[PDB]
C-alpha cells in the first residue's frame, strides 16, 4: 500500500526473496553497477 | 431481513469506523517504516491509538 517507492534496508535479503516470491513473473533484477542500466530500466518502465 | 438490517446497520458502523481506522493506516504506512520492532510499537499503539 505504498505511495513513495519501497526502498528497503535489508541486510540478510529476508526483503529480496519476498518480492521474488510475491512478484514471481518479470521481477528483472538491476544492480546500478549494471553497464546498459539505463536502457534495461526505460524498456521495463515503457512495459514491463 | 433480520439478517440483511443486521448487515447494514454494521456497516453504516463500518463506513464511520473505517474514517478513524484509515487515519491510523495511512500515518502507519507513510512514516513507520524505517523504525525498529519497539519503537514502532510505541508510535502507534502508545501514541496515535
Same mark, same amino acid.
Given at each position: 500500500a505504498c505511495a513513495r517507492w519501497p526502498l528497503i534496508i535489508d541486510p540478510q535479503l529476508q526483503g529480496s526473496t519476498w518480492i521474488r516470491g510475491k /512478484?514471481?513473473?518479470?521481477?528483472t533484477t538491476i544492480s546500478?553497477? /549494471?553497464?546498459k542500466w539505463l536502457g534495461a530500466l526505460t524498456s521495463s518502465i515503457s512495459s514491463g | 431481513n433480520k439478517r440483511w438490517t443486521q448487515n447494514v446497520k454494521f456497516l453504516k458502523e463500518n463506513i464511520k469506523s473505517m474514517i478513524g481506522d484509515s487515519l491510523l493506516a495511512s500515518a502507519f504506512v507513510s512514516?513507520?517504516?524505517?523504525?525498529?520492532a519497539k519503537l514502532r510499537l510505541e508510535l502507534w499503539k502508545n501514541t496515535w491509538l
Open positions: /512478484q514471481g513473473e518479470n521481477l546500478l553497477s /549494471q553497464p | 512514516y513507520i517504516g524505517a523504525f525498529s
